[PDB]
Design a protein around this nucleic acid. Structure first.
Length: 399
RNA sequence: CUGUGAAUG
C-alpha cells in the first residue's frame, strides 16, 4: 500500500479504528484516495452523516487543488471518489457552489485533451458534463483540441464516450466545430472506418435529426441544426461508396436509410452508390445489410427499380445462364437479400405495406424461382426460411 | 447455410 505511516498499525496495514475526520485533519487524504483499501475506507466514510466542516474539507482536498485533483482523476481508484465528491459538491448549495464549479472547470480545461484520453479521467469529465452547470459545461467543451488530437479522442476507446456525452447534453452551438471537423473528407474516412469513431459519427447524425425527443426550440436553433446536418450529409453522400462497404461505416449508411426523417438523403444514397450495383453490393459481407435496409425503406418509385435491376437488369452469364437472382439466391451474403425481397412482397400482399399489383408480379416471379429449385434450397437453411415465408464475388454485365 | 459495430475498482 501507499498509506502514510501515521495511519498504519504494527503490521504495516491500515488501522481498524480510523475516522474520516482524522484523515481530513492529517492532510493525507491524497495517499488514502490512491490506495485500494484507503479509497474503500473513504467511500464508506462519506456515505454517512457529514458535518459542514467535513464537507468543506472534502471539497478543498479533492476538487480544490489542481495538481491533487488531476492526480486523483487519473487514478484507477481515485476517480470514483472524485466523482462522488463532485456530485456531493454540486448538490451542496452554499455560498461556494459556483466557485467550486469554476475551479473544477478550470482544472479540467487545463488538461482537457490528456484527460479525455485517460481511461479514468474521462469518467470524471463525463460525470461533470451532465451534472455541472451548463454555462460552465459549454466552456469545458471549448477546451477540446482542434488539431489531429480531436481525431484521436474520436477514435479512442474511452474518449469517444466523452464526445457522445457532449453531443447528448450540450447545445449544438458549442460543438458545431466538431460537426465541421468530422465533415472534412480526410477526417470523415478515418473516423467512420474506426470502431468507436463510427459510433461518434452516428451519434452526431442522430442528434442533428429532428424527431420526437429532438425538438427545435427556436428558428435559429432549427436553422443551425439543419445546416450542420446538410454539411455532414454532403460529406457522407460524396463518399457513400466506400462507407457502405466498410466493416464499420456501413451502419452509418444503414441509419441514413432506416431513419424516415432523413428521407431525402436516403433516396440520394440509393441513387448515387447503390443503384446499378445491387448485385455486387448484395454479395458484400457488410454492404448486403445496406442493401437490405434500402429494400426495406426505399420509396415505391425506387423500390420498383431495385426489383427490376435484380429481375431484368443484368445480362445472364454466357457460360452457365445464371441471372442475378440465381447468383444471389445461392450466395453466402446475397441469400439474406433474397429473403428480404421475399419478405417485403409477403408483407405487402397481406396488409403490412401499401402500386399493389407490382408486388403481386414480383412475388410471383420470386415464388416461381423458389418453387423451381426446391431441392437445392431444401439442402440449405436459407431456402428452409424461404419456403416457410412463402407458406467469392461473381458479377454480371448490365443489360 | 448461413452473414457485420462502445470503455474503469
Amino acid at each position: 500500500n501507499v498509506l502514510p505511516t501515521w495511519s498504519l498499525d504494527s503490521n504495516g496495514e491500515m488501522r481498524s479504528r480510523l475516522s474520516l475526520s482524522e484523515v481530513l485533519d492529517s492532510g493525507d487524504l491524497m495517499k488514502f484516495a490512491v490506495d485500494k483499501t484507503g479509497c474503500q475506507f473513504l467511500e464508506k466514510a462519506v456515505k454517512g452523516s457529514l458535518t459542514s466542516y467535513q464537507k468543506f474539507q472534502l471539497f478543498e482536498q479533492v476538487i480544490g487543488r489542481k495538481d491533487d485533483f488531476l492526480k486523483l482523476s487519473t487514478n484507477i481508484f481515485g476517480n470514483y471518489f472524485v466523482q462522488e465528491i463532485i456530485g456531493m459538491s454540486l448538490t451542496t448549495y452554499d455560498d461556494d457552489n459556483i466557485k467550486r464549479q469554476e475551479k473544477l472547470k478550470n482544472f479540467i480545461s487545463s488538461q482537457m485533451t490528456d484527460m479525455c484520453l485517460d481511461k479514468f479521467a474521462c469518467r470524471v469529465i463525463q460525470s461533470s458534463l451532465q451534472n455541472m452547470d451548463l454555462s460552465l459545461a459549454c466552456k469545458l467543451v471549448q477546451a477540446l483540441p482542434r488539431d489531429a488530437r480531436l481525431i484521436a479522442i474520436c477514435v479512442d476507446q474511452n474518449a469517444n464516450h466523452v464526445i457522445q456525452k457532449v453531443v447528448a447534453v450540450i447545445p449544438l452551438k458549442n460543438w458545431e466545430f466538431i460537426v465541421d471537423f468530422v465533415a472534412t473528407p480526410e477526417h470523415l474516412r478515418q473516423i467512420c472506418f474506426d470502431k468507436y469513431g463510427c459510433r461518434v459519427v452516428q451519434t452526431i447524425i442522430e442528434k442533428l435529426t429532428a424527431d420526437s425527443i429532438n425538438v427545435d426550440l427556436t428558428s435559429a436553433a432549427q436553422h443551425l441544426r439543419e445546416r450542420a446536418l446538410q454539411r455532414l450529409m454532403t460529406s457522407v453522400t460524396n463518399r457513400c461508396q466506400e462507407l457502405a462497404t466498410n466493416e464499420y461505416a456501413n451502419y452509418i449508411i444503414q441509419h441514413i436509410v432506416s431513419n424516415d426523417d432523413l428521407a431525402v438523403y436516403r433516396e440520394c444514397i440509393i441513387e448515387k452508390c447503390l443503384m446499378r450495383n445491387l448485385l455486387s453490393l448484395s454479395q458484400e459481407k457488410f454492404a448486403s445489410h445496406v442493401v437490405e435496409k434500402a429494400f426495406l425503406h426505399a420509396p415505391m418509385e425506387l423500390l420498383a427499380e431495385m426489383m427490376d435491376e435484380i429481375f431484368d437488369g443484368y445480362m445472364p452469364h454466357p457460360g452457365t445462364g445464371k441471372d442475378a437472382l440465381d447468383i444471389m439466391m445461392f450466395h453466402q451474403f446475397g441469400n439474406y437479400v433474397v429473403q428480404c425481397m421475399l419478405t417485403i412482397c409477403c408483407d405487402a400482399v397481406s396488409g403490412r405495406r401499401q402500386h399493389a399489383n407490382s408486388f403481386q408480379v414480383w412475388l410471383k416471379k420470386l415464388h416461381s424461382r423458389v418453387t423451381k429449385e426446391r431441392h437445392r434450397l431444401s439442402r440449405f437453411s436459407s431456402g428452409k426460411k424461404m419456403i416457410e415465408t412463402l407458406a467469392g464475388n461473381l458479377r454480371l454485365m448490365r443489360t
